Every structure is written in C-alpha cells, then in structure tokens.
Amino acid sequence: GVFEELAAGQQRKYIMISGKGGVGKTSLSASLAVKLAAAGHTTLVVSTDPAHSLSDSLAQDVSGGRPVLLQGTDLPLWGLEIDPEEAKREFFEQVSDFMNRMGMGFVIDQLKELKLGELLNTPPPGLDEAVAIAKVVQFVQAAEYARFSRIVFDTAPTLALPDFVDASLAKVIRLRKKLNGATSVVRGLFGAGESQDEAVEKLELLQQRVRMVKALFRDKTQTEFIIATIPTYLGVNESSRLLQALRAEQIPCKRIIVNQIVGPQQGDAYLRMKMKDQIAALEMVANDPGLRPLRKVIAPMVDVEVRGVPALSYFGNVVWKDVYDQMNQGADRKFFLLGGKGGVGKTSCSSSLAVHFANDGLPTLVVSTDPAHSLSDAFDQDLSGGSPVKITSPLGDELPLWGLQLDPEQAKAELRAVLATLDGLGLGVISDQLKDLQLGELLDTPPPGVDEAIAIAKVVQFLKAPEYSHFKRIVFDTAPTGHTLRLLSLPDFLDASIGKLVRLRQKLSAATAVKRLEALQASMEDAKAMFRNQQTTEFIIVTIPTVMATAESCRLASALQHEGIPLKTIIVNQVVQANATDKFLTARRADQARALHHLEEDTGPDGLASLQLIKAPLCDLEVRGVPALSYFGNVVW
Ligand SMILES: Nc1ncnc2c1ncn2[C@@H]1O[C@H](COP(=O)(O)OP(=O)(O)NP(=O)(O)O)[C@@H](O)[C@H]1O
Ligand SMILES: Nc1ncnc2c1ncn2[C@@H]1O[C@H](COP(=O)(O)OP(=O)(O)NP(=O)(O)O)[C@@H](O)[C@H]1O
Ligand SMILES: [Mg+2]
Ligand SMILES: [Mg+2]
C-alpha cells in the first residue's frame, strides 16, 4: 500500500515530513520512524527543536546532540536532537608606524575602530539550519553507530537558505582570500594574518556541506517529501503553495497527509475532548500569575465566519461591547496593538475594533502588517498597495476608517535599498565596497521579528500634515508571528543602530550619507516612544481555549508585563459553547469535506494539488508513548 513504498528497498531513503504549525508533524514523523524500524530498517529520526519535541514525544530522552538509541525495546531506532546555536559556534569559529608619522594615525585608528574584523567574522545568519541537514548526512554516512537504512526528518515548519548562507559564505571567503597577500596595515584593519590558508581551507569545507544539502534535497534516489496538514481551508490553500515551491526547486514530493481529521463514527468523543480543554485553559486564564491584572474578554465562537463590514460591526458588539469599551477614555489619540499566534482570529477582532471605532465619531486607522491579504479578506474590499484605503461596504453613512497593508518584506527591502567618498578609500588597497555593503546587512538581517517592526515604525512617523490632523485613534493588527518581543532588545537594537551610526560618524571625518541612519534613529525611537507609553497606547493578546496556546499566552504576557509594554487586554477568542456543541461538531466537520474537496480539486492532477492522500484520525490519546506511537503508526501508514 502506502507504507509498503516506505519500507521499499535497501537503498537508503530520507523521508521528510514537513508542513507548518501543529498539524502533528512530529508525532507523524515519530510514528513513521517507529513503524519503519518495526519493518526492520535501522532507522534514525531527527528534529531541530530547542524544546526537545522528539524527546517527550518519544517519552525517552534523545536530547543528546548525537544519535541516541532507545532502551526498553528490541527495536532498531535512533533519535537525534541537534543544537542549532552550537552548530555555528563549533564549525565557524613590520610594526612600521611611519604611517602615524605621515599623519595616518588618525585614519588608521578610525578604520580599526570601524571594527571590520567583526563584520568579517560574524557567521552568516541561518547557517546552522542549512548545516543541520548536513550534520545529519554526517552521522549517517559516518556509520559510527549503525548502518542507517532510512532517515526520518521532522522539519522546522515550512530552500533559499542554503543559498543565502553559501552567498554570505562566499562573500566572506572571497574577502579572506584578498587578504592573505596584503599590506601590513591592511591586514591590521581586519585583525588578519599574512596567511589565510588554513582558514579558507576550512570555510570552503563548511560551504561544501551547505551545498551538499541543496544537493541532497533534489536528489532523486534518497530523498522524498511528505506534506502534513490539517483539514482547515487555509491549510489546504497553504499546502498547495508549498507544493508549488516543491515542484519548483524540484525536490520530489509524493504524499500529502491530513491529520486531526474527525471520524464520523467516533466523533462524539472529540466534542468531550475539546471540552475538557476549554475548561482547563479558561480556568488557567482565570487564576494565572500576571494574567490577573489585565482585562479578560471571553468571546464565543460565532454562527459563521466574518467576511464583511456589518458582521465585523456586530462581532465588535460581542467582544469589545458586551465587555468593556471603557478603554476609549484617555488622551485624544489612541494606539491599540493586537497580536496573537496564528489561528486565533485576530484580524476579525482587530478589524471590528476599528469598525466600532468608526461609527463612534472618531477617525481611525487599522494597519495590516499581515501579507496574507488578511485585512483585504476582512472588510472584503481588497485593500491593496501601501497607501490608505477609505472604508466602505455599508449603506451610505459616515465612514471614519482607513486601513492599509504593509508587506513587512517589501518594507525591509525598501529600507535596504534606501541604504544602498570613503567608498573610494576602502577600495584604496583593493576593491571592497560591494562585499562590505552586502555584509554590512549581514549584521542587519539577524533580528528575528523585525520585518514588521519596520512597517510599524514607518507609520509611527506618519503623524504629519496629511494624516495626524486627520486621525484620532489607530489600531495595529500584527502578522501571525513573533512581533511580540518580550526581552530587552529595544534600547539594544537601537544601540546596534547608534553604535554603527557613531562608528560611521567617526570615519566620515577622516576622508577630509549617515543622516539617514539618524532618520531611522528618530523613527525607531518614536516607534519606541509610543509603545512604552502609558496613556495613549495599549496592547492586546488574542488567543484560543486550547490549553497549549493558553499557558503560552500567559508566559508571553507575563514577560511582556515586566518588559514594561502597556499590554492591558487579553482575548480568548473562539470559545465553543456547550448548548451549541451539537451544531459545532456538525460545523467543524462541515468545514472538513469542504476543504477536503477544495484539495481534491486543485490545479488539475498535474502541477501540484492532489498527489497521494493520507488521512489521519483525530482522537483520543496523549500520543506521547512509544507503543502509543506504534498504534498511531499502524492506524495511518
Ligand atoms: N492525530 C492526532 N491524534 C492525537 N493526538 C494528536 C494528533 N496530532 C497531534 N496530537 C497531539 O498534539 C500534541 C502536539 O502535537 P504534535 O504532534 O507534536 O505536532 P507537531 O508535529 O510537533 N507541530 P509543531 O507544533 O509545529 O511542533 C501532542 O500532545 C499530540 O499528542
Ligand atoms: N469568535 C469567532 N467565532 C467564529 N469564527 C471566528 C471567530 N473568531 C475568528 N473566527 C474565524 O477564524 C478566522 C480568523 O482568521 P484571522 O482573523 O486571519 O486570524 P488567524 O486565525 O491567525 N489567520 P492567519 O492570520 O492567516 O494565520 C476568521 O476567518 C473567522 O472566520
Ligand atoms: Mg516539530
Ligand atoms: Mg491576523
């Protein structure tokens, strides 16, 4: 059948379970590894998890950086948990001053204090990932432990990265080559020796490894892919897009699995399942440390999805009205930032907050940093581009609302492009400007959630004649990600900026611009100036009754609380209600064969769509046990 081809041959096969965000990909890949080891393959299963996902989903601790065999079985199976932040840390890491006499002392001391050696020695971002897939081929080629018949990779959710690291490696590698024969003083600005031979020998190797992965993924004999997703519409929608990319960079992908599908027979169980959760979580939201001080709003699910202008107005009646809109008194201007992990509905909320704001007499702006065409699907107007769009699909009335979509990516490369004398001087010994601008950003990309923190700070500045005059309250719907940043990087990313605007200020003088970096300084500091502002601004976490995203939200709120940010509000958004439980099962099961259909027909048979379908039933297990897993395993494969 299906699993027959995955027990197929002696030829080593690397199965990739990949997908996004809590489909069960881990228990999916785990279960597979098990049923595969059962079959007789000496098999290794792999995750890149800081949190040790594979560890407690096996119930045996594999968290050792190198492959761990499992005690308690006669089965041939190995777990592997790889450390990204130590992947780079381990693999990557005469006096004639007659120059000072000519007066060079000033210019050499300014360039040395531009600390180029740092920019040269800073490892390119994302490295360890690309190297990780390679670390795997290493333990298994090495054959130190056993002769590995199959490998099962549970990937980090959702190919450009092996490239960008190769590129940022090549840039750095080419510039240590221009550095072996070089002047005494030139080698001195980088801290570099007279011989780069051993370094460049080693950096070259690393890059060959980074290359080996992009080579292996496309490799037609060993590699195979399997997409994992849940029955929701967007999951099928998204998965299609990832098969587009899969047929694109041309890595073989033969199977999509659907997990957490509800069996018509035993469905009545699932209802009680979800229920124990809602209670557990809600209970937690009640008593949780630090959750206590912030506003709580429990909203129920709704009759059906909110695609429209009136619907949002009424949603607003539910969330912000039946509970307190007394958040509206304050200064004349108000900022509200809603954020939440993906799946919790925070557009329908954020939108509705803006809509309830509109008719209330007050001009308001909703900002969508979500690329998804979210807010475009929200008011159903397709608000596109970067400029404000006036808000109408009413019967005729006062519409004091605008909203705009700022792609956080287009917002980054807009900033990168804007940053694209001393040019000649650096080129003075040899030509470096290309390589050092591009690597000037190799220090710039390292921030994690900042694609959007661009867009936000952009509009923060937008108070002005054309706008600040026009607007009273505004609201930020962040993208379904990490825009919520809970440690102190705010004064410190600002110090990255001022550190390098001051180094650059140092060496602009010694060539006989950077005011832009001063514009960014004021924008960031003005973005910061409102975020930490007590009166005008407040933050909101939108979340759901599943106890996982609950205790997560608690943490992220507990940390955001002591981070100082005025987060005044939580929202537990889709609460199923008991009296409606009958309808809700038939509802979420209705979604199923809808989206299941929307998959069964996607872009013909050929490009993308339907490949080979794997259905995995929802309930009900802890699913953390080894035999549990063999069970899950025999059920699906
Ligand atoms: N089909 C399923 N049947 C029963 N329990 C499931 C199923 N899928 C997931 N779970 C449970 O969901 C929890 C976490 O899901 P998991 O299988 O680890 O998803 P994942 O692959 O790790 N995705 P991610 O959240 O991005 O790491 C575990 O406690 C599992 O027991
Ligand atoms: N209280 C509710 N009752 C019923 N349906 C809801 C409720 N809240 C949200 N929804 C539905 O869930 C969806 C929420 O999607 P959205 O507002 O984009 O946030 P999201 O779930 O994180 N999606 P995305 O941003 O693309 O990752 C909407 O399409 C609504 O139809
Ligand atoms: Mg995982
Ligand atoms: Mg959203």
CB 412 within 8 A of CB 392: no
Strand partners, 538: 336
The Cα 360–Cα 48 span in angstroms is 49
Integer-rounded Cα Rg, in Å, for the chain is: 28
Helix (H, G, I), strand (E, B) or coil at 121: helix
Query: Cα separation of 408 and 435, whole Å?
Result: 25
Q: How far is the CA of 212 from the centre of ligand 2 (A)?
A: 41
- Tell me, in angstroms, the distance from the centre of ligand 3 to residue 263's CA: 24
**Nearest atom (ligand 2) to Cα of 370:** 25
- What is the structure's resolution, reported in angstroms to one decimal? 3.6
3-class secondary-structure state, position 16 = strand
Partners of 571 in beta bridges: 297, 542
Task: Say whether 507 sits in a helix, a strand or coil.
Answer: helix
Annotated binding site for ATP: 20-27, 259, 341-348, 573
H or E element that contains 560? helix 547-562
DSSP H helical ranges for 261-329: 267-287, 309-316
291 contacts 550 by C-beta, under 8 angstroms = no
Pair 445, 125: CB distance under 8 Å:
yes
CA 23 to ligand 1 centroid distance, Å: 6
Cite the DSSP H helix spans in 288-421.
Answer: 309-316, 346-358, 374-378, 408-418
Residue with tokens 């939201």: 285
CB-based contact 24:636 (threshold 8 Å): no
Q: What is d(CA 37, CA 44) in angstroms, rounded to the nearest whole number?
A: 9
Q: Which CATH architecture has domain 13-91+127-169+179-262+619-636?
A: 3-Layer(aba) Sandwich (3.40)
Calculate the CA 7 to chain-centre distance: 34
Q: Whole-angstrom Cα distance, residue 225 to residue 254? A: 6
Intra-chain end-to-end CA distance of the chain, in Å? 9
571 secondary structure, DSSP code: E
Q: Is 49 a catalytic residue?
A: yes
Q: 48 in helix, strand or coil?
A: coil
Nearest Cα residue to atom 26 of ligand 2: 372
List the one residue out of 208, 630, 544, 528 whose CA is nearest residue 345: 544
Q: Which residues of 168-184 are buried (b: 16+ CB within 10 A; e: fewer)?
A: bbebbbebbeebeebee
Name the amino acid, one letter, at 96.
S
* Residue ranges of the binding site: 20-27, 259, 341-348, 573
Q: Which residues line ligand 2 (CB under 6 A)?
A: 234, 299, 301-302, 305-306, 342-348, 370, 372, 374, 480, 573-574
Other residues' Cβ atoms within 10 Å of the Cβ of residue 313: 18
Mutate to test the pocket of ligand 1, among 16, 18, 26 (most ligand atoms within 8 A of CB): 26
Residue 592 corresponds to which tokens in the numbers above?
Answer: 């199923």
Of 154, 370, 436, 451, the active-site residue reads 370
In the block, residue with structure tokens 């100036």? 529
Report strand pairing: 401-405 vs 389-390: antiparallel
Residue 537, amino acid: T
From the CA of 15, how far away is ligand 3's center (Å)?
Answer: 15
* DSSP-based three-state secondary structure for 511: helix
Distances (CA, A) of 364 to 250, 470, 541: 46, 9, 20
Report the DSSP beta bridge partners of residue 337: 476, 539
Q: Which ligand is nearest to the CA of 81?
A: 3
Q: Ligand 1: which residue has its CA nearest to atom 15?
A: 24
Helix segments in 59-177, DSSP class H: 85-91, 98-101, 105-112, 116-121, 127-142, 160-177
Pull the structure tokens for residue 630.
Answer: 């063999």
- Most ligand 1 atoms within 8 A of CB, residue of 262, 623, 636 to mutate: 623
The CA–CA distances, whole Å, from 94 to 87, 106, 344, 430, 501 equal: 37, 19, 65, 20, 32
- Ligand 2 atom closest to the Cα of residue 479 is 25
CA–CA distance, 155 with 421 (Å, rounded to integer): 47
Q: Determine the distance separating the centroid of ligand 2 and the alpha carbon of 396, expressed in angstroms.
A: 27
Report which protein residue has its CA nearest ligand 2's atom 28: 345
With a CB cutoff of 8 Å and minimum separation 6, the contacts of 225 are: 15, 16, 18, 246, 251, 252, 253, 254, 255
Question: How far away, in angstroms, is 22 Cα from ligand 1 center?
Answer: 6
SS3 187: helix
Q: How many CA atoms lie within 13 A of 6 on its CB side?
A: 28
> For residues 273 and 79, what is the distance between their CA atoms, to the nearest angstrom?
30
Sequence-separated (6 or more) residues with CB below 8 Å from residue 199: 176
Q: What is the dihedral of CA 284, 285, 288, 293, to 10 degrees?
A: -160
> C-alpha angle 48/49/51, rounded to 5°?
170
The pair of three-digit structure tokens given for residue 493, joined into one six-digit string: 């990313």
* Cβ–Cβ < 8 Å for 404, 450: no
The C-alpha torsion from 486 through 487 and 493 to 494, rounded to 10°, is 90
The residue whose CA has the least distance to atom 15 of ligand 2 is 345
* Nearest atom of ligand 2 to the alpha carbon of 319: 1
Could you state, in order of their start, the residue ranges of all structural domains in the chain? 13-91+127-169+179-262+619-636, 268-407+450-486+533-577
Distance CA 373, CA 482 (A): 18
- Which of 306, 344, 571, 577 to mutate for ligand 2's pocket (most ligand atoms within 8 Å of CB)? 306
CB 338 within 8 A of CB 353: yes
Residue of the CA atom closest to atom 2 of ligand 2: 301
Other C-beta atoms within 10 Å of 102: how many? Answer: 9
* Nearest-CA residue for atom 17 of ligand 1: 24
Atom of ligand 2 nearest to the CA of 306: 31
Q: Which ligand is nearest to the CA of 28?
A: 1
Kind and range of the H or E run holding 530: helix 515-531
CB distance 154 to 53 below 8 Å? yes
Q: What residue type is assigned to position 39 of the chain?
A: A
Q: Which CATH superfamily is domain 268-407+450-486+533-577 in?
A: P-loop containing nucleotide triphosphate hydrolases (3.40.50.300)
Closest ligand 1 atom, residue 616 Cα: 1
- The bound ligand whose nearest atom lies closest to the alpha carbon of 305 is 2
On the 0-12 / 13-18 / 19+ scale of CB atoms within 10 A, 198 is exposed
What are all long-range contacts of 315-324, with beta carbons under 8 Å and residues at least 24 apart? 315/348, 315/349, 315/351, 315/352, 316/352, 316/353, 316/355, 316/356, 317/356, 319/349, 319/352, 319/353, 319/571, 319/573, 320/352, 320/353, 320/356, 321/356, 323/295, 323/297, 324/295
Which atom of ligand 2 lies closest to the CA of 315? 1
Residue with CA at minimum distance from ligand 1 atom 23: 22
Category of 78 on φ-ψ map: left (φ > 0), alpha (ψ -120 to 50) or beta? beta
Cα of 6 from ligand 2 centre, angstroms: 37
Cα 584 to Cα 36, 473, 575, 587, 637: the distances in Å are 37, 36, 11, 5, 30
Question: Where are the alpha helices (H) located in 288-373, listed in sequence order?
Answer: 309-316, 346-358
Q: Which ligand approaches the C-alpha of residue 311 most closely?
A: 2
- The CA distance from 178 to 432, in Å, is 9
DSSP class of residue 469? Answer: T
Q: What ligand has the least distance to the C-alpha of 22?
A: 1
Question: Which amino acid does the sequence have at 279?
Answer: I
495 is catalytic: no
Q: Whose CA is nearest to atom 14 of ligand 1?
A: 24
Enumerate helices (H) and strands (E) in the chain, giving the number of each: 24, 16
Residues β-bridged to residue 141: none
What is the phi/psi pair of residue 504, to 5°? Answer: -70, -30
Are the C-beta atoms of residues 581 and 552 closer than 8 Å to each other? no
Q: Which atom of ligand 1 is the closest one to the Cα of 624?
A: 31
- The count of other CB atoms within 10 Å of the CB of residue 316 is 23
Distance CA 553, CA 558 (A): 8
- Grouping H, G, I as helix, E, B as strand and the rest as coil, residue 537 is strand
CATH topology agreement for domains 13-91+127-169+179-262+619-636 and 268-407+450-486+533-577? yes
Q: CA geometry: angle at 239 spanning 234 and 240, to 5°?
A: 100
What the block records as the tokens of 559 is 């940390």
Instruction: Write down the catalytic residue from 49, 219, 277, 360.
Output: 49
Closest of 445, 380, 15, 81 to residue 225, by C-alpha: 15
CA pair distance 64, 68, nearest whole angstrom: 7
Contact present, 616 and 260 (Cβ < 8 Å): yes
Query: Which of 348, 572, 591 maximizes ligand 2 atoms within 8 Å of its Cβ, making it the mutation to test the pocket?
Result: 348
Distance of CA 278 to the CA centre of its chain: 27
3-state secondary structure of 312: helix
Amino acid at 15: I
Distance 517 CA to ligand 2 centre (A): 38
**Total Cβ atoms within 10 A of residue 608:** 20
Q: Which of 233, 305, 591 to mutate to test the pocket of ligand 2 (most atoms within 8 A of CB)?
A: 305
Question: How many whole angstroms from 206 Cα to the centroid of ligand 4?
Answer: 39
